[PDB]
Structure formats: structure tokens, C-alpha cells
Structure 1
């Protein structure tokens, strides 16, 4: 099934762009969003996390208290391995369930890392480094110090652009951005049909 890899540095707007493709009928696969769904209120994985570390891991609205989980993980690196063993298999299953359950002409695979050989096409969401730094501050509420260092750990802008088949500058007017997404959608639709034959 035709697959487009969506990638881009932190704060470039991957989620907003993927959400626009989603409103066009495209199946989006994002393990970051699936990981938060397998521990949503009432799920077995959240119960297990609470059974293990205590009810304080569940906040007033029945959702995971990620502050206390971070602290626990930070104080006991052994719990990260158990958390992985718990969640990783649930993310794999829910990833395949969404693939197998897709009737869309093509599939959008959100992948922050770059896994460039697994997809039929690579779409890079790009913005200037400064824009990356600010949009991180207001989206996550973190500090810039932490933002610069998160950005240092990732691939460089030139690296992403060099591996891209298509690029979308998530800057300027949203309408223009959404229009560019629609044009790419039409392109990918055609590449999917071509591939089918």
C-alpha cells in the first residue's frame, strides 16, 4: 500500500500538517499519538501503570500523570525497560490494526526519525531553526535552553531536505499551507494509482 513518510524537526508543524491530510481522508499513522492512546483513561495499560506505581499516577480527570511518571522513571531507570515492554507491543498492534483497516488510496506515516527506505515517498515539513525554537516553547511550555538541546540531538535541516522527495515550508498563511497540502494530496493520489498498476 502506497506510503508517504512525513518527517520534520520538533516544532515544524508535523502534527498540523498530518491533521490536514487526515481531513482529506488519508490514514495517518503516528506512533507518538498511538502511545498516548494506549495509556488513555480506562485502558488496561494505565491500570497496570497505576497498579505498579500507585493511584497517584492517575490525575483528577483519569489520565496519566506524566510528571510523576517522569520522576519515577528518572529515579529508577529500571522502570523505563518495564514501561517499554508494556507499551511497545501495544503500539505495534494498534499500528497494524490501523494499516489493515485502511481503505484510503495511500497512507501517511508520521516518523520523527529518519527509516527513509520503508516508504514510497518522503515528505519533509520545514521551517527556520528560530521558528523551531519558539514554536517549541509555546506548544510544550518548556524552556528555550531545553529547546536548543532537543534540536541539537536531531538531524540537521540540510539532512532532512536532502532526503526529502517533497518539501512544505510550514510558514506564512495557513490557507496557502493547506492549499499546498491539497496539491500534494492530489500528487500522492496519482502516484498510488500508478503504483497499483
Structure 2
């Protein structure tokens, strides 16, 4: 068993920021969001199924997913959300095992936005690391980064687990609410070490 850490956290909480720090220290990163984008890019592994299931309406002229039109439809119709996720999730799952098999570091970190929401991911990981922060900080950061409105972010936040549920399912926690990310490194240093020890013991 390659030692596996699930890194999760709500939208805008800091998963990417924390993940990078662990990568700089030699952890092997498998970002399920990068995979989700590539499998729906031009020539992506998920596109045949998506065209078939949704129609050429949702395939843009470059072959990729029309992320806009879809962005709307799965918000509008949560029968459609489940229909898309039923295509993408198994593929993401699969690409994850495949990247994990090839990973060269002493342990792996799977960056998984909807980790605790899913039964399968908790079982797949040796530990869960939650990057936590207040909901209003999530909102401000995601408005700033992606240009959305409150309502748009609030809508994603509502489709995700509460802070309390996330914190309850954690083995490890990094509260990322400082004005600045410079102090995160101290926390990541210590977790890295503990992770090396965990892995070595298994």
C-alpha cells in the first residue's frame, strides 16, 4: 500500500495552495480537478460519452466541453448533474489510480474537493487532511479569483459539505484563514514529517 492522503476542503479554502507546499517537499500530487479538466478538454477521455449523453449542443467547436452551457444546465437540472457526474467520476477515479500507480514520491496526496461527501474516497485514503476556513473567506476568495458573484459561490458552497461535517471527518486540519499563506509552511513541514513516519510504518 502506497501511503495515501486525501486532501480536501471547500471551494476557495486553499487546497491548491497547501497541495503545492506538500509537492515542494516531495509528496506526489494527484489533483482530481486537473484530471476532471483534462478528461473534458479537446480529445478528452470523457467527451464521447458526453456528446452521446447530452448531444453536440454541449460540445464546443474545438471538441472540448462547452463548460458554460453545461455550467448552467447542471445547476438548473440536478437530474443532469447526476448524469454528468456519472460519466466523469468513474473516469476521474480511474485516472487517479493510474497516476498513483506511477507516482515516485514517498506518499501520495489525492486532492479531492468532494472527499467526505463520498463514501468511496474516505475508504481509499489512509488519512484525511482538511484545509479549513470560514465560509465568507471562501466567498471573497472565489469572487476575486474566478469573477463569480456571491450567489454563484454560495450555490457551490451549498452543494458541498458543511465546515462542521468536514472537520468531523478529518484526521488532520489546516486552518487557512491568515491574511497570508507564509505561515502555512510551518504546518506543512510538521505534517510532511508525520506523513513520512506513517508511510514508513505501512
Aligned equivalent of 2:125, options 119, 126, 129: 119
Q: In structure 2, how many angstroms separate the alpha carbons of the residues matched to 1:175 and 1:44?
A: 38
Equivalent in the alignment of 1:142 = 148
C-alpha contact 1:10 1:151 (8 A) present in aligned 2: yes
**Is 1:176 paired with 2:183?**
yes
Q: Any stretches of 5+ residues in structure 2 without a counterpart?
A: none
Cα deviation, residue 81, structure 1: 6.8
Q: In structure 1, how many angstroms separate the alpha carbons of the residues matched to 2:155 and 2:57?
A: 33
| RMSD over equivalenced CA pairs, Å | 3.0
Aligned ranges 1:129-168 → 2 under 5 Å: 129-168=135-174
Equivalent in the alignment of 2:95 = 94
Equivalent in the alignment of 1:190 = 197
Change (3 A) 1:149 1:49: closer
**Is 1:6 paired with 2:7?**
yes
Max radius of gyration: which structure? Answer: 1
C-alpha contact 1:58 1:64 (8 A) present in aligned 2: yes
Cα deviation, residue 49, structure 1: 5.2
TM-score (norm 2): 0.77
Equivalent in the alignment of 1:69 = 70
Equivalent residue pairs, number: 194
C-alpha contact 2:5 2:127 (8 A) present in aligned 1: yes
Q: In structure 2, how many angstroms separate the alpha carbons of the residues matched to 1:108 and 1:7?
A: 10
Equivalent in the alignment of 1:57 = 59
Q: In structure 2, how many angstroms separate the alpha carbons of the residues matched to 1:40 and 1:135?
A: 26
Output one character per residue of 1:119-163: Cα deviation in whole Å (capped at 9) or x when no partner.
221211011221112112122322112323432343222222222
Q: Any stretches of 5+ residues in structure 1 without a counterpart?
A: none
C-alpha contact 1:171 1:177 (8 A) present in aligned 2: no
Q: In structure 2, how many angstroms separate the alpha carbons of the residues matched to 1:76 and 1:194?
A: 47
Change (3 A) 1:70 1:160: closer
SS at match of 2:196: helix
Q: In structure 1, how many angstroms separate the alpha carbons of the residues matched to 2:77 and 2:158?
A: 26
Q: In structure 1, how many angstroms separate the alpha carbons of the residues matched to 2:159 and 2:45?
A: 33
Cα deviation, residue 2, structure 1: 1.3
Q: In structure 1, how many angstroms separate the alpha carbons of the residues matched to 2:176 and 2:73?
A: 37
